[PDB]
Structures are given as structure tokens and as C-alpha cells.
């Protein structure tokens, strides 16, 4: 399969409660493997996957150092942001970053990422060409102008094409039996009378990995986008995902309706009809 | 493998 590594960091200021809280997490696909919490006693990059525990001591000493350096830079970034937006230093503000890389089956670089959000909205992102920046407002295009002068893109591009794919390829080879798997969704429908003349038909997908999945209702093979309820895909807590989709249906019309399930772990998409 | 040099905004 094709694979991704994502590093996510959140800095939240809290004036008159000391220095910004910083929390960072790392994923390969939908599997978390590390975390750092600047309020924890450890002050370390901690394993959050049994399989990463195999990395040698250099790995943990170095990863701790880098994320701590990040914590310090994103602290200063909260302040720079405060200046750009002309905002008081009484308010709590949130700075969010995501970087990482994708590889294909062969292990070859596919795509890099490097993006920030201030107070919950896009601030700046590296474009998919890796040579320039999308600035989202007047404040971000100060950063964009500064980063184009400093050549941050071709430097971060060197990390995304290098250390980032190397990391990913090593996690894929050391976490093999966890990460190079698909669990296909286990699918069933439930009929739920609402009135003597109505029912909710609920389409279930359980125990699937990875998280990405499409659940669709049709009626005579027309999509029911408008009248379908659909829950966010949710974690089971055991490294699998759950989802459902529901349509309210006239009593008697049940067999006009089909549920379509697409997922990377299915040979061909599933069609389900209220048969049982 | 984390970055070794985060940029300033």
C-alpha cells in the first residue's frame, strides 16, 4: 500500500498561568506512535505504540531534543502572531502545525506537508510543489514574504524528501505487522421502526482499518445525500474504526434502498439491501 | 523522525 507520516503540534497560551502548553503527537496512517506533553513530569518524547519501543536510546534522546526545540520555537511563534494581529496579551490563543510526508508501494516520496493554523483557521501552508507558500490573510503574507527571502521552502523540502521518508520507511519496516495491514469493515443493516409507517435503516461498518471509508445510501440507484444521517468515523479504542449511515424510509419501500461501502480493504465495494 | 529546524512566523 501507499503510506503517510503526520506530526501534529498544538501550542495554547494561558496568560497569568505561565508559559504556553505544548502537545505533540505522531502518526503513521491512523496509528499513533509518539507524543510529547510539556505539562508531563517526564519532559520526554514517549512511545504510544508497543512497536516503536524497539528504537535504540539515540532515537529517544534525539526525538526528545527536537520536539523540545519545536516547543520553544512555537512559544515564540504565539508572540509573533500576537504582534501581527495586534491582539492583547490577556487572551489564550492556539497555534497548530502539521508536517510529514507520503510514500507509495515502492517506498518513493509522493507528497510533503508543512502547514500552520492560528486560532483554528489556516495561517500558512507549503504548496504541493514544495517551492512556495499559500498565505491565508494579511498577517500570513508577512511570514510568506519573510520565508521566501530566507529560502525556508527549499530547506524544509530537504527534510521532507530526506529525514521524513527515511523515518516513515523505518517505521513501516519495524511496525510492519501493525502498519502494513487492512482490516476490512464488517457490515450489517438494522431496521428501526419510528412510527407504524416509518423506519430508520442503519448501515454499519465495524472493526476497519485504516479510517478512510465511504458509506452511501441509494434509492433505485440514485444517491440519497440529502436525507441520509452519517456519524463521524470513530475509534473503537483497539486500533480499528466504526461508522454508520441511516435513512428514514417509508414502511414498504425498504427494498428500493441500498447502502454502498467503499474501503481500501475490500476487493470491490459492497451493496447491502434490507433482506434479513 | 522530527525536524531539526522549525521556522519563525
Amino acid at each position, epitope marked *: 500500500g501507499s503510506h503517510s507520516m503526520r506530526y501534529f503540534s498544538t501550542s495554547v497560551s494561558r496568560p497569568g498561568r505561565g508559559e504556553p502548553r505544548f502537545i505533540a503527537v505522531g502518526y503513521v496512517d491512523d496509528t499513533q506512535f509518539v507524543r510529547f506533553d510539556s505539562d508531563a513530569a517526564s519532559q520526554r518524547m514517549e512511545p504510544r505504540a508497543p512497536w516503536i519501543e524497539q528504537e535504540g536510546p539515540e532515537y529517544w534522546d534525539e526525538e526528545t531534543g527536537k520536539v523540545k*526545540a519545536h516547543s520553544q520555537t512555537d512559544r515564540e511563534n504565539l508572540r509573533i502572531a500576537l504582534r501581527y494581529y495586534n491582539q492583547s496579551e490577556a487572551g489564550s490563543h492556539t497555534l497548530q502545525m502539521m508536517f510529514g510526508c507520503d510514500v507509495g508501494s515502492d517506498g518513493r516520496f509522493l507528497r510533503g506537508y508543512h502547514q500552520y493554523a492560528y486560532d483554528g483557521k489556516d495561517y500558512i501552508a507549503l504548496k504541493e510543489d514544495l517551492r512556495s507558500w499559500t498565505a491565508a490573510d494579511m498577517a500570513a503574507q508577512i511570514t510568506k514574504r519573510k520565508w521566501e527571502a530566507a529560502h525556508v521552502a527549499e530547506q524544509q*523540502r*530537504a527534510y521532507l524528501e530526506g529525514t521524513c521518508v527515511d523515518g516513515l520507511r523505518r517505521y513501516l519496516e519495524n511496525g510492519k505487522e501493525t502498519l502494513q495491514r487492512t482490516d476490512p469493515p464488517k457490515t450489517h443493516m438494522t431496521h428501526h421502526p419510528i412510527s407504524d409507517h416509518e423506519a430508520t435503516l442503519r448501515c454499519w461498518a465495524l472493526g476497519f482499518y485504516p479510517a478512510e471509508i465511504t458509506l452511501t445510501w441509494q434509492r433505485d440507484g440514485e444517491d440519497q445525500t440529502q436525507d441520509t444521517e452519517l456519524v463521524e468515523t470513530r475509534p473503537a479504542g483497539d486500533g480499528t474504526f466504526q461508522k454508520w449511515a441511516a435513512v428514514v424510509v417509508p414502511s414498504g419501500e425498504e427494498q428500493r434502498y441500498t447502502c454502498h461501502v467503499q474501503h481500501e480493504g475490500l476487493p470491490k465495494p459492497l451493496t447491502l439491501r434490507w433482506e434479513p | 523522525l522530527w525536524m531539526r529546524l522549525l521556522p519563525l512566523l
Partner: T-cell receptor, first 111, second 111 residues
């Protein structure tokens, strides 16, 4: 255009205090102090990210004391100067990763 | 771990190729620097390469990089007497971009 340092040359008496200024390129957030001896590559002394002094070498005795009070110009202080403190004191600034160096401060401590 | 290793001296004939060689410490370093110093002070940033490039050329200068073996080399096309100086290869160390330097290759150009 480049980084600026004052003075270009200092000669103090041994056991006296001395102070150099560094003025980085306008709006450069990152400031590095290095030490160079004739015949050698420069050696890291300290790192400022605006105001914050984020990383300092164990080549600094307690006597060595750098400030960047306003995230602007930096000062380095040596208390009770010794013969062994004779060197070029280099300042460099970058926006990210490209470090630009000053003309240094050549220090000589004589008895 | 280790240091940045380069030769202290290299002699060339005016008009011959100069190759200056360097081994650096950490394969993850995203950029590598060549600095040059002439009589007096003044570390001049001469050229740089990112770790995702095999090669970079800039007039009479050429930089070749081997990331796996951590070999960096400055090649000078048409060495003039004016090219006589000390060349340092410099690598970012740790999680700022503080530089560690080679000991410097003094370049002597014979008429």
C-alpha cells in the same frame, strides 16, 4: 547590508571586565556567538531566538554572560578576563538557516 | 560523537582544479556550508548545498554531496592567485542551526 560589531579590536588588562556589541542584519530573529582562534574553525558560544537565550555551550565559564535585551543588538560580557580569553569573537544572524557573520571583535588580554 | 574533518593545507598551480574535501557528522543535516576567510577577519558565506541535491554549480565553484557517506567537496574550476584563503565546511548541529566548523583548509595558489 551585513552584521556589525563594536569594537573591531579590544585590548583590556588581565582580570578586568570587557563588553562587545553585535548588531545583526535588520529583523534577523536568530543570533549566534562563536569564538575563533588563529588556525581553527569557529566554536559555538550561544544562541538567541529573539530575546530568548535557547542554547549555550559548556565552553562558557560563569564569567561569560550574553544578553539580547530587546531581541535586537546582543552584548557579550567577560568578567575577570584571562590570557586564554584572547580570540576573535564572531557574531552571525539568520532569518532561518543562512548564517551571515560580522567582522568579529579581536580581543587581546595582556598582563 | 565526531568532528567535521577537513585537511589543514592544499597547494594548487594557478589554472589547475582545486578540490577541497570534507566529512560531516550527521546524515540528517539538510544543508552544508562553505565559508572563506582572507587575511584579516570576515567569514564570507561562499556557497551552500541542501541534502536533497547531488551537485550545485556557481560560476568557477562546484559543490558535490554524498549524503549516505557524508562527503562534501568544493571544486574550483580555474584557480587564480586571488582564490588563496582558508575554506571552512560548516554543518548545522542539533536543533537550532548553530554551525560546527571544520578546522579550515588553507588554499595556496602557486604562480
Amino acid at each position: 547590508t551585513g552584521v556589525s560589531q563594536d569594537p573591531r579590536h579590544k585590548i583590556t588588562k588581565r582580570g578586568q571586565n570587557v563588553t562587545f556589541r553585535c548588531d545583526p542584519i535588520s529583523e534577523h530573529n536568530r543570533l549566534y556567538w562563536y569564538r575563533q582562534t588563529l588556525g581553527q574553525g569557529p566554536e559555538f558560544l550561544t544562541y538567541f531566538q529573539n530575546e530568548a537565550q535557547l542554547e549555550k555551550s559548556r565552553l562558557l565559564s560563569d564569567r561569560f554572560s550574553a544578553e539580547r535585551p530587546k531581541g535586537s543588538f546582543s552584548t557579550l560580557e567577560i568578567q575577570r578576563t584571562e590570557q586564554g580569553d584572547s580570540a576573535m569573537y564572531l557574531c552571525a544572524s539568520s532569518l532561518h538557516h543562512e548564517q551571515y557573520f560580522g567582522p568579529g571583535t579581536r580581543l587581546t588580554v595582556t598582563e | 560523537g565526531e568532528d567535521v574533518e577537513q585537511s589543514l593545507f592544499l597547494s594548487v598551480r594557478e589554472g589547475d582544479s582545486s578540490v577541497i574535501n570534507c566529512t560531516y557528522t550527521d546524515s540528517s543535516s539538510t544543508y552544508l556550508y562553505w565559508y572563506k576567510q582572507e587575511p584579516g577577519a570576515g567569514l564570507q558565506l561562499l556557497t551552500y548545498i541542501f541534502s536533497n541535491m547531488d551537485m550545485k554549480q556557481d560560476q568557477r565553484l562546484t559543490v558535490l554531496l554524498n549524503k549516505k557517506d557524508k562527503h562534501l567537496s568544493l571544486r574550483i574550476a580555474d584557480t587564480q592567485t586571488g582564490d588563496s584563503a582558508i575554506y571552512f565546511c560548516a554543518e548545522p548541529s542539533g536543533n537550532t542551526g548553530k554551525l560546527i566548523f571544520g578546522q579550515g583548509t588553507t588554499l595556496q595558489v602557486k604562480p
